[PDB]
A paper describes a structure:
Gap junction channels (GJCs) mediate intercellular communication by connecting two neighbouring cells and enabling direct exchange of ions and small molecules. Like all connexin homologues, Cx43 monomers assemble into hexameric hemichannels (HCs), also known as connexons. HCs that reach the plasma membrane of one cell may interact with their counterparts on the neighbouring cell, forming GJCs, typically organized into hexagonal arrays at the intercellular interface. GJCs formed by Cx43 are crucial for a wide range of physiological processes, from propagation of heart action potentials to maintenance of neuro-glial syncytium and skin wound healing.
Author numbering:
A (entry chain C), B (entry chain B), C (entry chain A), D (entry chain E), E (entry chain D), F (entry chain F): 2 to 105, 151 to 235
Write the structure that this text describes.
Amino acid sequence: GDWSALGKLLDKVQAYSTAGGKVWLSVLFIFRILLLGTAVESAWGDEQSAFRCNTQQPGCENVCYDKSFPISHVRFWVLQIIFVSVPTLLYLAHVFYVMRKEEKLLRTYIISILFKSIFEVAFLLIQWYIYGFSLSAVYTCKRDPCPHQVDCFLSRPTEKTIFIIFMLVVSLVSLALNIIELFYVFFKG
Amino acid sequence: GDWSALGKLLDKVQAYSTAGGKVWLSVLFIFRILLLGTAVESAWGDEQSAFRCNTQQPGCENVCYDKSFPISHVRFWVLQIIFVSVPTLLYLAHVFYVMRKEEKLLRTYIISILFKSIFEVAFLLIQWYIYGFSLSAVYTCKRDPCPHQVDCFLSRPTEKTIFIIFMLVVSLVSLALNIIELFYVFFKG
Amino acid sequence: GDWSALGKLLDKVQAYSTAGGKVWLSVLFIFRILLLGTAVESAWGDEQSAFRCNTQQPGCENVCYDKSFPISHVRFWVLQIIFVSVPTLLYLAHVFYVMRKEEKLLRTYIISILFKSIFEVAFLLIQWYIYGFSLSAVYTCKRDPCPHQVDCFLSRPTEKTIFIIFMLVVSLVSLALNIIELFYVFFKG
Amino acid sequence: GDWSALGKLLDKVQAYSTAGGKVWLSVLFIFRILLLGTAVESAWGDEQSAFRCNTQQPGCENVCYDKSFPISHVRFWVLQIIFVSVPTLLYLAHVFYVMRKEEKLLRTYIISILFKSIFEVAFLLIQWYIYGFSLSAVYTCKRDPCPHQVDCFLSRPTEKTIFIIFMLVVSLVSLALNIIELFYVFFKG
Amino acid sequence: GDWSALGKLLDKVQAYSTAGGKVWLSVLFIFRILLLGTAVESAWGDEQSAFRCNTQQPGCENVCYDKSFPISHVRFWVLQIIFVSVPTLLYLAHVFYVMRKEEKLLRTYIISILFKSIFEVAFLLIQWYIYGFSLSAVYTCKRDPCPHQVDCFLSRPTEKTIFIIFMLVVSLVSLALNIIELFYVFFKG
Amino acid sequence: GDWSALGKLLDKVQAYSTAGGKVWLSVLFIFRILLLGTAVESAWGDEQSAFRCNTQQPGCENVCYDKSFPISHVRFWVLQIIFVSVPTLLYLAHVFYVMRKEEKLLRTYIISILFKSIFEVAFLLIQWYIYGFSLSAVYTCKRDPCPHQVDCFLSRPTEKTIFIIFMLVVSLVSLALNIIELFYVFFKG
C-alpha cells in the first residue's frame, strides 16, 4: 500500500501546469492510443495486398506503389505518437531521479513543451508537404521499370481520408493546447 | 490496501444520479464492450476479401464497393463507443483533480449527459440518413470507371442485419435512459 | 488485504440459494466459457472459406450458404452465453449498490432466475424451430439468383454435430438445475 | 497479505492423499497444459487446409476426409484435458464452500478419483477402438458421393504419430498413478 | 507483503549449488525462453507452406518433405526446453512440500542434475545422429509413391543453419556448466 | 508493500554511473523495445511472401533471395537487442545475489560496459561489411541453379531504408553514450 508515493510523483510532475487543460490533454492522448491501437491497425491490415494495378509487367506495380506512397500511413502516426511521447518519458524519469536525489525543473518543462510543439508542427508540415491531406482512388505513376504510366486504384480511399480528417483536427487542437500552455507559462514568467 | 479511496471516488462521481438506472447503464455498456470485442470483429474479419463482383474490369469492383459502403460498419460502432466514452473519461478525470484539489460539479454533469445524448442521437440520425437499417444481398453501382452498372453480392447480409437490429434496439434504450436521467435532473432542479 | 469484503459480497449474493447446486452450476458455466473460448472458435475459424458449391455462377453460392445457414453457430451460442450472463451481472451490481447503501432482494432473485430460464428455453426452442439438431453434409437450395438447385457440401458435419450434442445435453442439465432452484424457492416460500 | 488462507485451502484439499505422488501428478498435468497450449495447436494449425486428394470431383475430398477422420485430434485431447479437470474443479469448489460453512469429504474424494480413472480409461479405449494409435500417409475411402475410392495423403504423419506415442505413454503413467492413489486409499481404508 | 517466504524458498532451493554459475545459468535459460518465444516461431511460421518441389504428382512432395524432415526443428527445441525444465519443476515442488512438512534433499539434487545432463546430451546426440547440423538448399528423395527422385528446395537454409550454430554453442556451454556443477558436488562430497 | 527493497536494488545497481545519462539511456532503450515490438514486426510481416522474381524456374527465386539477403533484417536487430540486454541481466542478477549474500563490483561494471560497447560496434561493423546501409529496388543474382542472372524486386525499399537510417542514428548515439560512460569511469579512476 505505497500508492501515495506515486500519487505525489504525479502531483509534482504536473504541479506547474494549467489548471484545466491537462485533463483533456490526457483524454485526447489516450483517445489516440485507443484509436491507433484498434482502428487504423485493422484498417491497414491488408493494405499492401489490397493494392494492385491493371498492368502485368513484374516490378512496375511495386515501384509505382512505392513512389505513390513512400511512407505507409499508420507508420507516420505511430512514429508521431511514440516520438511525441518521448519527452514525457524523459521528464518523468528526470523528476523520478530528482525526488530520489533530494530524498537524501521549470526550464526543463519549458524545453519539453517547446520541443513537443516543434515535433508536432514539423510532422504536420512534412505530411502536408509530401501529399497534403486529400487523395484520389486513381493514381498515376512515372517510373523507368515500366513504360508510360499506370493508373492504380486505392483500396479504401474514403474511410482513410475521413480518418485523416479526424487526425488533422485532433492535431490542430493539440497545437492549440500546447500554445495555450506556452502562453500560460509566458504570462506567469 | 487503499481501495477505499477509489471506492469513494466512485461514490462521489456517481452520487448525483438516479438510484436504479446506472446499474443497467453500466451493464448494457459492458454488454456493448464484450459484443463489439468478440462478435462483430469476428464477423467483419474478412469482409473486404469476401466482397466481389461479377465483372472483370480492374478498379470497378473497388470503387463500387467504396460507394456502396463509404463507411465500414464496425468502424462506425467503434467510433461511436469510443466517442461516447470520451465524456465519461473527461468527467472522471475532472473529479479526480477535484478531490485532489480540496485535499489541500453538477452543471458539468448536466453538460456531460447532454452532449452524450446529442452525440448518440446524431450518430443514429446520420446512420439512418446514409443507408437506414435495411440491406439487400444484391447492390447496384453507378461509377465512371466502369460502364453501366454491376450487381454486387454482399457476404452475410442476414447476420449483420440482425446485429444492427439488436444495436438499434440498444441505442433506443440508451436514448430512453439518458432522457430519464435528464428528466430526473430537471425535476430535482 | 481487503478480500474479506468481496468474500462477504459473494456470501450475501449467494446466501439465499441451494446448498449443493451452485457448485456445479459455476463449474458447468466456466466449462462453457473454456470450451467456447478455445474449441468452437478454432472449429469455425475458417468455416465461411471452407464452404463452397459445385456451381460457378457468381452470387448463388453466397445466397444459398446464407439461406442454408441464416445464423452462424458460434454466433448463437456466444449470444446465448452473454445474454444469460446479463441477469447475473445485473443482480451482482444491484447487491453491490445495496450493501453500499445500507453501509450508510429475494423477489429480484426470483425474477432473475425466471428470466434466465425463459431466455434459455426460448433460445433452445428457436434453435430447434429453425434447423433442429441434425444436419447433413449435402444441402439443397432454392433461390432466384441461380437456376434450379445446387447441392452444397458442409465442411465438418460430424464434429460440429457431436458438439451440438454435448451443448444440447448441457443445456438440458442447466434447465433441470434452474427448475430445481425454482422448486426449492417455491417450497421454502 | 492473506495468502495463508489459500495455502491452508490447498493443505486441506490435498491433505488426504499420497505423500510423494501429487508432485509429479501436477508436474505432468501442467506438462500437458504447456504442450497442448503450444505444440499441438501449432501442429494442427493448418491441417484442414493441408489435406487434399488427387481427385477433382467437388465434395468427395471433404466427405472422405470426414470419414477418414471423424474427430480432429487436438479436439479429442482438449476435451480429454478439460473433462478430466472438471472433477478437480468440482471438489475444490466443494471444499471451498465447506470451509466457508464450518467458518460459521473422504468418500467424495474417492468418487472423484474413481470417475477420473473411468473417464481417462474410457477416452483411451474409444480412441483405440476408432483408429488405434498407428497411421499411414495414404488412406482409402468408401463413399457414395464419389466413385470407387480415392487415395488421400496425410500432411505430417510422422510428427503427429510420435506425438501420440508420447501422449499414450503419459496417459499410461497417469493410469498407473491414479491406480496407485486408489490402492493407497483402499489399504488405509 | 509475504514475499519473504518465497525469497526464502529460493534461498533454500538454490542454497546447495555453485556460487557464481547459477547466475548465467538462469540468464542463458531465459535467453532461450525469449529467442524461442519470438525468433524461431517467426522463422518457421510458414515453413510447411514455403516448401515445394518441382514435380506435379500429388503426394510425392508431402512424403518427400516428411522423409527429408521427419521432425520439425522448432518442435525438437521446444520439446527439449520443456523436458529439461521438468526436473526443475519436480524439485521445486518437492522442496515446497518439504518446507511445508517441517512447518509442522542433496541426493535428489544430484539425481536432478544428472538426469538433466543425460537428457541434454541424449537430445544433442540424436539430433546429430539423424541429420547432424549442416544442411543444403537442394535435397534428394527416395520414395515409392513417386518415381526416381525429386530435388526439393529449402525455404531459408542460411538463417536456420546459423540459428542451429548458436543453439549448438549454447547447448555446449550448458553441458560445460552442468559438468561443472557435477564436479563441484563430487569435490565437496 | 515491500517495493522499498527493489527501489534500493535499483539505487545500488545504478549508483556508480553518470548523473544525467542513464535517463535517456533507458528512454532510448525502451524506444527500441516499442518500435521493434510494433513497427518492424508489422513491416516484415509478409516480406518473404512479398518477394518474387520475373523468372519461372523453380528454385532460383529462393536461392537468389537467400543470397541477396543471407540475414533477415528484423532478425539482426532482435538478436542485437537481446544480446546487448544480456550483460544487463547478468549484472542485475549478480548484484541481486550480492545484496543477498551480505544480507547474512565496480570492475564487473567496467567489464559489462566494455563488452556492451564491443558487441554494439561489432554488430554495426558486420552489418556495414555485409550490405552497408543502402539498398536498391532491383537486385542481381549469381547462382548455379538458374542460368545467367535474374533482376529481383524488393517489396518496400524506401520505408525500410528510412528505418535503418533511424536505427543507425540511434546506434551512433548509443555508442556516443557508452563512450561517455567509459570516459567518466576513466576520469574518476
